[PDB]
Each structure stands twice: as structure tokens, then as C-alpha cells.
Design a protein around this ligand. Structure first.
Ligand SMILES: *[C@@H]1O[C@H](CO)[C@@H](O[C@@H]2O[C@H](CO)[C@@H](O[C@H]3O[C@H](CO)[C@@H](O)[C@H](O)[C@@H]3O)[C@H](O)[C@H]2NC(C)=O)[C@H](O)[C@H]1NC(C)=O
Ligand SMILES: *[C@@H]1O[C@H](CO)[C@@H](O[C@@H]2O[C@H](CO)[C@@H](O[C@H]3O[C@H](CO)[C@@H](O)[C@H](O)[C@@H]3O)[C@H](O)[C@H]2NC(C)=O)[C@H](O)[C@H]1NC(C)=O
Ligand SMILES: *[C@@H]1O[C@H](CO)[C@@H](O[C@@H]2O[C@H](CO)[C@@H](O)[C@H](O)[C@H]2NC(C)=O)[C@H](O)[C@H]1NC(C)=O
Ligand SMILES: *[C@@H]1O[C@H](CO)[C@@H](O[C@@H]2O[C@H](CO)[C@@H](O)[C@H](O)[C@H]2NC(C)=O)[C@H](O)[C@H]1NC(C)=O
Ligand SMILES: *[C@@H]1O[C@H](CO)[C@@H](O)[C@H](O)[C@H]1NC(C)=O
Ligand SMILES: *[C@@H]1O[C@H](CO)[C@@H](O)[C@H](O)[C@H]1NC(C)=O
Ligand SMILES: *[C@@H]1O[C@H](CO)[C@@H](O)[C@H](O)[C@H]1NC(C)=O
Ligand SMILES: *[C@@H]1O[C@H](CO)[C@@H](O)[C@H](O)[C@H]1NC(C)=O
Ligand SMILES: *[C@@H]1O[C@H](CO)[C@@H](O)[C@H](O)[C@H]1NC(C)=O
Ligand SMILES: *[C@@H]1O[C@H](CO)[C@@H](O)[C@H](O)[C@H]1NC(C)=O
Lengths: 654, 510
């Protein structure tokens, strides 16, 4: 009926208080035959002998629980981890109270680990209320490559997903390493203002100094970290106005010991009144079996609602960690760490002062900064996009229409010819045409600047389980947009449901269809000729890879055989396919109605055949949920009202 | 000469130690004849295990260590992870226990578990489920740790799965010492699903199978699919384990312990000798019994840069960055009705080869049960209607709108003993009409191409072809370019014809 408790402390003095603490238990609860006892040790730098002693002193004795703390030297998970292993071999509970590592939160590896301090990752939940309090929507995540960072990232991802929201992007970095200013630069040309960070002290200091080099400390921009990132050198390089979270206890090892002893005594009394407690294995050597009541003791520890703790209610979460924990909100003002609020649950409470924002202002900044210079991406398409080389001076030719007005041309950068055949020189070139005209019109309507640059690969793109991968991933301008290289598409793009899940299509700006082109005698029967339905080697036909027609022929499984024909001769751009048909290398080409009728009205010698088997629209697409969709929609509506697009067509299609 | 350590940790008889030690020096077939020093712990406890480890660390210049364990221990893997993290020592695991894969690993570790990731096992088992296209499945787990990761994995796979794979129910139960049967055993009684996927421990599986038999959810029409953690001791399956259980393991499951040890030594020695080739130097020795020196060794980094992509004797023993194996060959094992574990399929290079075209659902009293709805289908190749081709080699299996089909076994000499069955893609008019028949009348079917000749003719007074396979009860129903004639009609029954034809005389227009 004798009980004993094991301690692994670092002060060698609280140990004596630990001796009192068990006495405190014997002074807080009855003694009887319970025989509440104490046992304590101090861990060593070499964990081998430490674990050996743990076996030969604690498991060998009638010890039913083990507590551990942090050493004065900063090593953290370095010390307690073998203990977490040792307990696992015998399922005895282990209590680590001075650790913020999420690795310890694992149950698969650390079977019987508990903590009254939530890890750094739980801090994510804290900042979850921040944006809710101040109505911040545009949130940027930057996280180290460490597993603790990954866990924090996924935790905050789950949290933001709970409100059916998302961070507009997340970025990863390595600890204490070389060039990091690329990430901060792309953060500059990002949209948001409020930033959140998670790293080590040296890592945070490096981020601070780099951001200071890049003027990120200015107004509007906001940073948000825990208490690790605001200490020492990181504290020195942290600019004023940074908001941080502080533990209410932090380093009061005495309070942790008192609360742990209280909850341990409560759980032990509950187990004793629930009887059948068996006994500790009595030594690592010899005894090789697990302890059967270990799961039972662990579950009663999970349900151990010892609310009489010094820190208040000691309430374990689902994982056995402190739930509804206490923290404080601190603001770094003029090198002074000033507190502004408190946190213990679903609602932060302001207590004093005002938030002195990092830019030195007093007003709460908005979460974003809309950039009046947008991004234009496209593909060279003669009916819609004309691309020519600029002169030696680097300007566009003074070429005027038949009416005498000059064509409005811009300088679109990008590779000089297709990348495999090209030396990959992103040579800026003159570009003009229908889509260019309409984008200029709508830009004048909305009064925003822009940057024009065609797509890198030259293909439209689709989700594809690419080589050595598993997830179907976009390529082309859809991929370039989802990555953020371009913010909106201007091209004769086809609307399809597959794109609809990922790219916001506005209302169509033009209507068109899909048809077949041949030269100059067996007038092809549209999409109803058997000679298409049973492919022949005498008749060769194809489309463009990673294109809308590819998606269409992929959806209709009844057409799959022609799709099987597609993968034989699919072309990469319109020019080579058109020339090959003109050279009779191909027999017939499936493509847009407008493109084919345009070339026929200009090039002649070739005719389209069959009706528009698939009618659709060319609509101006753009990024999901960005505000400009309604503006451009009503703009194209009113352009259709006055027929300005019809005037554009008459300017481009005679 | 490289010194390695062969650690024995599965207790057992002490005859194993010497009978492996004398063969340790008998590895002359491998380059750079190894000097292996072996040790076996008869207690299998952290203190003694660490004592032996640290003693051999201080004993001499050892470079690689291999360890074997009993099939029901888990903490030793974490202990060796601690060893390889603190001391920065490359190690390998074999046999039951340590071979279990731990997805999270300490960055300083080099323990490199020798096993298969759980999600990869899920991929294989869902491919097998696709073989028998059972879109309906129920997820049953216990509160055992890692079941959160297991449900995350099944969610990820179903999310990356192609078809609308019906998750009938995701549920968690209590297992272990006793436990509350109220609203849990009745929960079992209210669960309604023909296919179940499970995840629990070995004894948890033992208890759960006993409950399920007591639950009445056992027998034909009820199929189970469990991971490696649930199974254990393939040699000794308990009476609680129901017949017809399915999982997938490594090909080495059937190999002897000596063979496993020799293969591990071979992999270690091949990595070492690849280092010896590329850099002309023997592998850097390992650490010491006392504390560690510090940062990772660049030579140990070279071993970890040439180790991950090693092969030996036909088998590519490649490893994953997560300290486990990547895309190796696996054997889909199945418990038979004789309470024995045998080979039912093989998953290799993303390809499934099964010896059972249909799943045999034996009943309780050791007898097969034949479904009424499922039905054997036979046909003859014919270009306009019966299109046969090789399965899609790029992705394995068959493209949509096509049915997997097989030859008429090899019954001329191999009456069904050729476990690798040549799959074929069968599509055509007849395939479409039989698909519509199946989707209307709601019956399963079994397609195989007939080989013994042509449509069918009474030869020497006996018939052949589809006529033979059906009249002589070798098949159920036949489809194809079958004309109805009296001589075909006396012995077999025909339905009403669906497409009319006749005799015709073809000629050249010119
Ligand atoms: C077009 O884009 C606009 C900006 O993205 C936005 O509508 C704009 O809304 C603001 C806010 O009301 C309007 O600004 C007017 O009203 C404010 C508040 O009263 C005043 O301070 C301003 O000086 C101004 O009078 C803009 O006028 C309005 N823009 C337009 C074009 O109407 C919507 O996203 C889009 N709205 C429309 C109608 O297209
Ligand atoms: C289909 O018609 C075929 C020709 O009308 C005929 O198949 C032939 O059957 C004979 C059976 O005597 C085979 O001969 C076999 O036996 C002799 C000895 O009797 C051997 O010398 C031969 O090598 C052979 O083993 C022919 O080989 C066979 N021909 C073919 C092309 O199969 C039957 O009427 C029908 N056969 C089938 C399979 O449908
Ligand atoms: C109560 O606890 C004390 C200290 O934790 C125990 O004293 C040690 O006990 C171990 C084994 O029980 C001995 O190896 C040590 O030599 C003892 N040290 C001292 C200073 O006494 C004590 O035995 C425990 N008693 C009970 C009844 O649990
Ligand atoms: C650390 O916490 C302990 C409690 O676990 C503090 O000790 C007592 O705390 C109460 C708080 O209500 C005070 O009223 C007592 O006066 C404290 N005792 C003594 C002897 O002063 C302790 O003060 C805390 N120390 C720090 C540095 O936080
Ligand atoms: C890295 O970024 C640029 C060049 O990439 C360099 O000027 C800067 O000083 C570097 N910063 C760090 C922190 O290495
Ligand atoms: C930072 O601001 C100064 C002026 O305050 C300016 O000269 C410098 O170019 C800026 N640098 C960056 C990277 O923003
Ligand atoms: C600390 O948290 C506990 C948990 O309920 C509770 O006492 C209170 O919220 C905090 N303590 C104080 C003194 O406010
Ligand atoms: C949060 O803090 C307050 C102030 O300390 C305290 O009453 C309690 O712990 C919590 N109160 C509320 C309303 O959440
Ligand atoms: C010019 O553009 C700015 C920002 O895009 C806008 O605020 C302003 O109203 C525009 N002016 C006109 C005349 O459109
Ligand atoms: C394994 O990969 C390394 C580079 O990662 C390569 O040099 C070596 O040839 C490969 N094959 C081996 C080590 O057998």
C-alpha cells in the first residue's frame, strides 16, 4: 500500500521542497497506509547513465510516477527524451512541465507523456483570436523547416480552416542559414500587411535584421511571435511595436511542482480506491514485460480534474496538456516590454494601454495593401496576341492602322522562342492586339498599372500527376497564377468546370466554338465521322497538349479512342500545326472557331468543316475572391452595351 | 575488413546465437569479407540492451550495426533511435518489432527502420480493393495511439483515390483490458457493411475478432482488411483470427532468420563498398560508449548519400528519407480457410498480380459459398465485338470502359496453378451490352477468354468452345458473335437474339 514518486529536477533545492511537496500531499490528504513517499534525482549531461540510474533507482523501487524539468543550460528536448523512451518500455506516466516542444505532444512515440504547458504550436491558437479581434483577413505565414514549425503550421492551418478561411500564402525557411532576403522581398511584393512568424532566437534575430535591411519595419506591416523570438539577441534586434505572448508562470518551477504533486496525489488516491494497482516492474533488468495498469493510470490522469492547483484549474486537454491556459499580451514600446491584455480561452481581454504599432502609429492598420500595378500573363495567339521583336533601340514600331491611328502596343517580356529550342533569354518584345486592346480599355476604366509577360511554358495547362509526383498539379498560366507569378489572366482562355474550382472566371467577353480545319473529297463529318471514331493511319489529326480540347476529349470517355489518337500527334502551338496541315503533315486540326475563321479569312487555302460541336465563351479570368471580379464583369457588360468590343473586332477582324 | 555488429534481441533459444555466429564468418560471397561480432540479449530490457550497445561501442571500431527483435515489442525501436541520435551511428532493424515504421524521426538519427510505411500499405490495399472493386468499406479503429495518423492517412488516400470510394463509417472503439460492451458491442451489432478496414494492435485484433464473431458480423458477405500492426506471428495465427483475412507484407516474411541477417549484412556491406568505390576509403568508424563528438560526419553523410539507393540480388533495397523503405516489392498475404497464411497477390513496381480472379468467400463450416448474382462469362475473340489488348503498361491495369479479362486459364497443362495470370483489357460491343445487363439485372460476373478452339462444334460427338464450356458446366453464360442454330440449340438454351445477321457472300467491287 506504499506509494512513491520520482523527480528529476535541476535546482537540487526544489528537490527538498519536493520532499516537502510529498509531505504537502501527506498534509493535504490522509496518510493511513497510503505511505506517500518521495524520490528525486538530478539529470546528467550524458543521458545514458541518467537512464541507467532511472532504471536502477526508480523502476527498481515502488515508483508510480516520474516528473522532470528543464536544466539551466538551454537544450530543452535534449534532456527529457530518453525518459520518455524509458517510461514507454514500462508504460509508466511521465510529467514534463518545462517543455514547449511539440515532439513531446506525440502519443505514438511518447506514450505516457504529459505537460501543463502547451507547446509552441498551441500558441497558434492564441494568434487565431488576434485576426478575429482586429478583423484581419490577409494573413501571411512564414515558418522554419523544423518539425516544431511544421506542427505549428498545420495547427494554425486547421484553425484558419475552422472558420473556412485560408492564409493567402505560407513560406518555409531554414534555421540560421544564408540568404533569406528573397523571401522577404517576395513578401514585399505580396499583398498582406500583417505577418506572423515562428523560429528560434537566433533565427528570429536574423529575420529581424534582414527585415530591417529591407524596410519591413515600416507602418502597416505587423509581426507576431511567441516568447522564444523576443529574447536575447532576438529581443535586441526586435523593433518596437512587436506583439508577443507571455506565460503567466513561465519559470515558476515551484508552482509547477506543487500543481503536479497535487494532481499526482489525487490520481493516486483515485487509483487506490479503484484498487487492482499491481506494482512497478521492479527493475529494468530481469523484468521485460509492460505494466498493465499503465493505460488505466494514464486515462485517470487524463480525467484528473485537479482544480485546486496554484495556477488555478489544472485541466488536461484531449492530448493530456493544459487546456484553457493563461497567457498575457505584451507590446514592445520604446525598448520597454509593456503588457496590454490577457488570454485564457475564447476571448482576449484588454487591460491597459494602447497598441503602439511597429510603424510608430497609433491606429490599427488594415491587413492588406492593394497593388495598383497588376500582372498580365498570356500566350502569343495571332488572332488575339501579336508578338514582334522590338528594334535595336528597344521600342515598338510606329505602325498605324488603315484608319491611320497607331496600334496600341506594349513591351511584354519572356523567352525568345520556345524554351527547349531557345537559349532561355527572356527578351522583351513588342506585343499588341485584341486582348491587349481590351485590357488597356478596362485598365483605363479601373485606372491601374500593370506588367505584361507571356507564360513560360507556352501551354495552357491542367492538373497532372507529373513525373515522380503524386498530386495532379496545374501548369501553364493557371499554375503561374496559383503560385502568384501573375495575378490575373488575359487570353482567349476557355471556361471549363475543372478550371472553375480554382480560377475565378468572370462573365464571357466573347462567344466562340470548336471546329475542324482541313486544306483546300470526303468533307469530314464533324465529330460524327466514323473515320474519326475508328482512327486510321491514313487520317492523322490531333490537338494541343494541356489544353481545353484535351480536357474535353478526356471527359467524354466515349471519345477516348480519339484521345488515344491525340497522344500520338498532339502539337505544342498553333503555328506548327497550321503549317503542317498546310504541308499536309497533319490532315485535320480541332481548335477554336474564331481562330480558324480568322486564319481562313486571312490566309485562305484552308477551310473549316462541320458545325461548332462545342460552343462556349472566351471569358476574362482572374484570381479567386479578389475584389476586381465584379468591376471587370460590369465593365465588359457595358462594353457589350455600346458595342466597343464589336469595334475591336472590326479593328482586328475584317 | 569491416567490423559490424549482429544484435540478437528476440530472446528465444540460445542455440540461435552460436548458429548465427559461425555463419557470420561464412559470408565470403560478399565483397570485403566482413568481420561480424554478434551479441544476444536474453532479457530484452532497455538497461541491458544499452549496456551491450555501449560496451560494443567501446569495444572496437565498428561501422554498422544490425538488430533483430521479437514480434511484440515497440519501445526498442525508440531506444535504438536514441542510440543513433545521441551517438550518430548507422543501424538497421530486422524481424518483428523494430521493423515497424515510425514516421517521425529525430534529425540526428540514422536508425533507418527496415519496413513499409502505413500509407504505402494503404495504397496497396486500396489497389487490391479496386481489383474486386468494392467501393463500399467501413473504417474500424480502436483508441490505440497512431489511429489519428491512420485516419489522416485513409482520408488522404481516399482523397487521392480515383473512384467515389464509399466511406461507409469511420469509427473508434475501446479495446484492451475488458472495456464497456454497452453501446460498443451493440455498436458492432448496428454496424452494417460488407467490407471493413481495421487498425489496431495484435492483441487488440485478437479481442476485436472474438467480439465480431460474437457480434454476428462474420462470415461470407463480410470481409476484413488490416495493416501489419494488427497481424503478428504468421506462423501461429490464433483461433480468434477469422478465415479469409487480407494484408500485405515483405517478401522476406517466408525467408529464414539467417537469410534475413545475411541480406541485412549484404545491404550494409554494399553501402560500405560503394563508399569504398567512390571515395577509395573504408567507412568512418562509429562513436564511443561515452558522450558524442558533435556534428554529423561527412563520411557518414557519404554513407547516407550512397546508402538510400542500394540494391542486392535483384531486390532494390531503396530507403525513404523518413527512415524507412521506398517502393519495394510487397506480397499480398491472405489467411486461408485452413488457418494458414499464404500468398494471394503480389504488388511490385506499381503492378498487381493475383492468383484469384474472384474472391472465394468460404463459410463457417469450411466450405466455399458461390454467389447467385456473380456468374462466369466466356467468349471468343472477334475484332468487331470482342476487342482484346494488353493492359495499360503506363499505369497498370485497364483503362475505363474496359473490363479485366483472362485467358481460359492454361488448363491444357496448368489447370489453375499459374499464379501470375496474364490480365487483358477486354472492350467492345459485347462488353458494353454485358455491362448494361450487369447494371440492370444487378449481378456480378467473371470474364475470361476461351482458348480451346473457336465458337464451338460437336467434334467426335463432343462439343467445344463456349458451347463446350457451358454445356459441360465449365461456364455459366456465353456471349459473342454467336449464331443460333438447331445443332447449337438442342443442348443449350439461347435468349432472344439482339442483333440480326445471316450468311453473306463478300466480293470485290472491281
Ligand atoms: C469597383 O471597384 C471599387 C474598388 O475596388 C469598388 O467600388 C468602390 O467603392 C468605393 C467605396 O464606396 C467607392 O468610393 C466612393 O465612396 C467612398 C465612401 O463613400 C468615398 O470615400 C469615395 O471618395 C467614393 O466617393 C468607389 O467609387 C467604388 N468604385 C466604383 C467604380 O464605383 C467595387 O469593387 C467595384 N464597384 C463598382 C460599382 O464597380
Ligand atoms: C478447326 O478446323 C481445323 C481444320 O478444319 C481442325 O483443326 C485441326 O484438327 C486436327 C485434328 O486431327 C489437328 O491435327 C492434329 O493431329 C494430327 C494427328 O491426327 C497431328 O499430326 C497434328 O500435328 C495436330 O496435332 C490440326 O492441327 C488442327 N488444325 C488447326 C489449325 O488447329 C478442326 O476441325 C478445328 N480445330 C479447332 C482447334 O477448332
Ligand atoms: C521512501 O523514499 C526514500 C527516498 O526516496 C527511500 O530511501 C531510499 O530507498 C531506496 C530503495 O527503497 C534505497 O536504495 C536508498 O538507499 C534509500 N535512501 C535513503 C536515504 O533512505 C525509502 O526507502 C522509501 N521508503 C518507502 C517505504 O517507500
Ligand atoms: C512561485 O509560485 C509560488 C507558488 O507556487 C509562490 O509562492 C507563494 O505564492 C503565493 C501566491 O498567492 C504568495 O501569496 C506567497 O507569498 C508565496 N510564498 C512565499 C514564501 O512568498 C512564489 O512566490 C512564486 N515565485 C515567483 C518568483 O513567481
Ligand atoms: C542574401 O540576399 C542578398 C542576395 O541574395 C544579399 O545581399 C543579402 O545580404 C543576403 N542576406 C542574408 C541574410 O544572407
Ligand atoms: C529603404 O528606405 C530608404 C529610405 O528610407 C531607401 O533609400 C531604401 O532604398 C529602402 N530600401 C528598401 C529595400 O526598401
Ligand atoms: C489561470 O487559469 C485558471 C484555469 O481556469 C483560472 O484560475 C484562471 O483563468 C487563471 N488564473 C487566474 C488567477 O486568473
Ligand atoms: C480571463 O481572465 C480574467 C481576468 O484575469 C479572469 O476573470 C478569467 O480567468 C478569464 N475571464 C474570462 C471572462 O474569460
Ligand atoms: C486613377 O487610379 C486611382 C487608383 O487606381 C483611383 O483612385 C482614381 O480614382 C483613378 N482616377 C480616375 C480618373 O479614374
Ligand atoms: C546512389 O546515388 C549516388 C548519388 O546520390 C550515386 O553516386 C551512386 O552511384 C548511386 N548508386 C549506388 C551508391 O550504388
Amino acid at each position: 500500500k506504499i506509494v512513491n514518486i520520482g523527480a528529476v529536477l535541476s535546482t537540487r533545492k526544489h528537490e527538498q521542497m519536493f520532499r516537502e511537496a510529498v509531505n504537502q500531499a501527506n498534509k493535504r490528504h490522509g496518510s493511513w497506509k497510503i505511505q506517500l513517499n518521495a524520490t528525486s534525482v538530478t539529470h546528467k549531461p550524458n543521458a545514458i547513465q541518467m537512464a541507467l540510474s532511472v532504471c536502477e533507482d526508480l523502476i527498481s523501487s515502488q515508483v508510480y510516477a516520474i516528473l522532470v524539468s528543464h536544466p539551466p543550460t538551454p537544450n530543452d528536448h535534449f534532456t527529457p527524451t530518453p525518459v520518455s523512451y524509458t517510461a514507454g518500455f514500462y508504460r509508466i506516466p511521465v510529467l514534463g512541465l518545462t517543455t514547449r516542444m511539440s515532439i513531446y505532444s506525440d502519443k505514438s512515440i511518447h506514450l505516457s507523456f504529459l505537460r501543463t504547458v502547451p507547446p509552441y504550436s498551441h500558441q497558434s491558437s492564441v494568434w487565431f483570436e488576434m485576426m478575429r479581434v482586429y478583423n484581419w483577413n490577409h494573413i501571411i505565414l512564414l515558418v522554419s523547416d523544423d518539425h516544431e514549425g511544421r506542427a505549428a503550421q498545420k495547427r494554425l492551418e486547421t484553425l484558419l480552416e475552422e472558420r473556412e478561411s485560408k492564409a493567402e500564402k505560407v513560406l518555409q525557411f531554414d534555421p540560421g542559414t544564408k540568404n533569406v532576403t528573397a523571401l522577404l522581398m517576395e513578401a514585399r511584393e505580396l499583398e498582406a500587411r500583417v505577418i506572423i512568424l515562428s523560429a528560434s532566437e537566433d533565427d528570429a534575430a536574423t529575420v529581424y535584421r534582414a527585415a530591417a535591411m529591407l524596410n519591413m519595419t515600416g507602418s502597416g506591416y505587423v509581426w507576431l511571435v511567441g516568447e522564444r523570438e523576443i529574447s536575447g539577441n532576438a529581443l535586441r534586434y526586435a523593433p518596437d511595436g512587436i506583439i508577443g505572448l507571455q506565460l503567466i508562470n513561465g519559470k515558476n518551477e515551484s508552482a509547477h511542482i506543487s500543481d503536479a504533486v497535487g494532481v499526482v496525489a489525487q490520481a493516486v488516491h483515485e487509483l487506490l480506491e479503484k484498487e487492482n494497482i499491481t506494482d512497478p516492474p521492479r527493475g529494468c533488468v530481469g523484468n521485460t514485460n509492460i505494466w498493465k495498469t499503465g493505460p488505466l493510470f494514464k486515462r485517470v490522469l487524463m480525467s484528473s480534474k485537479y482544480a485546486d492547483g496554484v495556477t488555478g484549474r489544472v485541466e488536461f486537454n484531449e492530448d493530456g496538456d493544459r487546456k484553457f491556459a493563461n497567457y498575457s499580451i505584451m507590446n514592445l514600446q520604446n525598448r520597454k516590454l509593456v503588457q496590454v491584455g490577457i488570454y485564457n480561452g475564447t476571448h482576449v481581454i484588454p487591460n491597459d494601454r494602447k497598441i503602439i504599432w511597429p510603424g510608430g502609429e497609433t491606429e490599427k492598420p488594415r491587413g492588406y495593401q492593394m497593388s495598383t500595378r497588376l500582372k498580365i500573363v498570356t500566350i502569343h495567339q495571332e488572332p488575339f496576341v501579336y508578338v514582334k521583336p522590338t528594334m535595336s533601340d528597344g521600342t515598338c514600331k510606329e505602325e498605324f492602322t488603315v484608319n491611320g491611328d497607331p496600334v496600341k502596343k506594349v513591351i511584354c517580356t519572356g523567352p525568345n522562342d520556345t524554351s527547349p529550342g531557345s537559349p532561355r533569354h527572356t527578351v522583351p518584345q513588342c506585343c499588341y492586339g485584341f486582348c491587349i486592346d481590351l485590357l488597356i480599355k478596362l485598365a483605363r476604366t479601373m485606372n491601374f498599372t500593370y506588367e505584361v509577360h507571356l507564360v513560360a511554358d507556352g501551354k495552357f495547362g491542367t492538373q497532372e500527376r507529373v513525373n515522380n509526383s503524386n498530386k495532379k498539379e496545374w501548369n501553364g498560366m493557371m499554375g503561374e497564377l496559383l503560385s502568384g507569378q501573375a495575378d490575373m489572366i488575359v487570353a482567349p482562355l476557355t471556361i471549363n468546370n475543372e478550371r472553375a474550382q480554382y480560377i475565378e472566371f468572370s462573365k464571357p467577353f466573347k462567344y466562340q466554338g470548336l471546329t475542324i480545319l482541313v486544306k483546300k473529297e470526303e468533307r469530314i463529318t464533324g465529330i460524327n465521322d466514323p473515320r474519326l471514331r475508328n482512327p486510321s493511319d491514313k487520317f492523322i489529326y490531333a490537338t494541343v497538349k494541356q489544353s481545353s480540347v484535351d480536357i474535353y476529349f478526356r471527359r467524354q470517355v466515349e471519345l477516348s479512342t480519339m484521345y488515344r489518337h491525340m497522344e500520338k500527334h498532339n502539337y505544342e502551338s498553333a503555328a506548327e500545326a497550321i503549317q503542317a496541315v498546310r504541308d499536309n503533315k497533319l490532315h485535320a486540326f480541332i481548335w477554336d472557331s474564331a481562330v480558324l475563321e480568322f486564319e481562313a479569312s486571312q490566309k485562305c487555302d484552308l477551310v473549316t468543316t462541320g458545325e461548332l460541336f462545342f460552343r462556349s465563351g472566351f471569358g476574362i479570368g482572374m484570381r479567386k475572391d479578389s475584389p476586381w471580379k465584379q468591376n471587370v464583369s460590369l465593365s465588359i457588360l457595358k462594353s457589350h452595351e455600346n458595342g466597343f468590343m464589336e469595334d475591336l473586332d472590326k479593328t482586328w477582324v475584317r | 575488413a569491416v567490423t559490424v555488429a549482429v544484435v540478437f534481441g528476440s530472446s528465444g533459444p540460445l542455440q540461435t546465437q552460436a548458429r548465427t555466429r559461425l555463419t557470420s564468418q561464412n559470408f565470403l560471397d560478399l565483397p570485403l569479407e566482413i568481420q561480424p561480432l554478434t551479441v544476444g540479449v536474453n532479457n530484452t530490457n532497455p538497461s541491458s540492451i544499452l549496456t551491450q550497445i555501449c560496451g560494443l561501442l567501446g569495444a572496437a571500431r565498428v561501422h554498422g550495426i544490425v538488430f533483430e527483435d521479437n514480434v511484440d515489442t515497440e519501445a526498442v525501436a525508440q531506444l535504438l533511435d536514441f542510440v543513433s541520435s545521441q551517438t550518430h551511428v548507422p543501424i538497421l532493424s530486422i524481424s518483428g518489432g523494430s521493423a515497424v515504421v515510425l514516421t517521425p524521426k529525430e534529425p540526428g538519427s540514422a536508425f533507418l527502420q527496415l519496413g513499409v510505411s502505413l500509407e504505402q500499405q494503404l495504397q496497396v490495399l486500396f489497389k487490391v480493393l479496386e481489383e474486386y472493386d468494392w467501393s463500399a468499406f467501413a473504417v474500424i479503429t480502436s483508441l490505440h495511439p497512431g489511429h489519428a495518423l491512420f485516419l489522416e492517412g485513409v482520408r488522404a488516400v481516399a482523397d487521392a483515390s480515383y473512384l467515389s470510394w464509399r466511406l461507409l463509417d469511420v469509427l473508434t472503439l475501446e479495446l484492451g483490458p475488458g472495456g464497456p460492451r454497452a453501446r460498443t458491442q451493440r455498436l458492432l451489432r448496428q454496424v452494417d457493411a460488407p467490407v471493413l478496414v481495421a487498425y489496431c494492435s495484435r492483441e487488440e485484433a485478437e479481442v476485436l475478432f472474438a467480439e465480431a464473431a460474437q457480434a454476428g458480423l462474420v462470415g461470407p458477405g463480410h470481409v476484413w482488411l488490416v495493416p501489419n500492426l494488427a497481424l503478428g506471428s504468421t506462423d501461429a495465427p490464433p483461433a480468434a483470427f477469422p478465415v479469409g483475412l487480407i494484408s500485405v507484407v515483405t517478401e522476406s516474411w517466408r525467408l529464414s532468420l539467417r537469410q534475413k541477417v545475411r541480406d541485412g549484412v549484404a545491404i550494409l556491406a554494399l553501402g560500405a563498398h560503394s563508399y569504398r568505390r567512390q571515395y577509395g576509403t573504408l567507412p568512418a568508424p562509429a562513436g564511443d560508449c561515452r558522450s558524442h563528438p558533435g556534428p554529423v560526419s561527412p563520411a557518414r553523410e557519404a554513407f547516407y548519400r550512397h546508402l538510400l539507393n542500394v540494391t542486392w540480388e535483384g531486390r532494390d533495397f531503396s530507403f525513404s528519407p523518413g527512415g524507412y523503405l521506398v517502393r519495394p516489392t510487397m506480397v499480398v498475404i491472405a489467411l486461408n480457410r485452413h488457418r494458414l497464411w499464404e500468398m494471394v497477390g503480389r504488388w511490385d513496381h506499381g503492378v498487381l498480380y493475383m492468383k484469384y480472379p474472384v474472391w472465394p468467400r468460404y463459410s463457417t463450416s469450411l466450405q466455399p459459398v458461390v454467389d447467385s448474382r456473380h456468374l462466369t462469362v466466356a467468349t471468343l475473340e472477334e475484332r468487331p465485338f470482342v476487342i482484346v489488348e494488353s493492359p495499360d503498361p503506363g499505369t497498370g491495369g485497364c483503362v475505363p470502359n474496359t473490363v479485366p479479362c483472362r485467358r481460359q486459364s492454361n488448363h491444357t497443362f496448368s489447370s489453375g496453378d499459374l499464379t501470375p495470370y496474364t490480365k487483358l483489357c477486354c472492350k467492345g460491343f459485347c462488353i458494353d451490352i454485358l455491362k448494361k445487363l450487369a447494371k440492370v439485372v444487378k449481378f456480378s460476373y467473371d470474364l475470361y477468354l476461351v482458348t480451346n478452339g473457336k465458337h464451338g462444334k460437336r467434334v467426335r460427338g463432343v462439343w467445344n468452345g463456349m458451347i463446350g464450356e457451358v454445356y459441360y458446366k465449365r461456364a455459366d453464360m456465353a456471349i459473342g458473335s454467336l449464331t443460333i442454330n438447331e445443332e447449337r440449340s438442342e443442348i443449350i438454351d439461347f435468349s432472344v437474339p439482339f442483333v440480326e445477321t445471316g450468311i453473306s457472300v463478300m466480293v470485290s467491287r472491281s
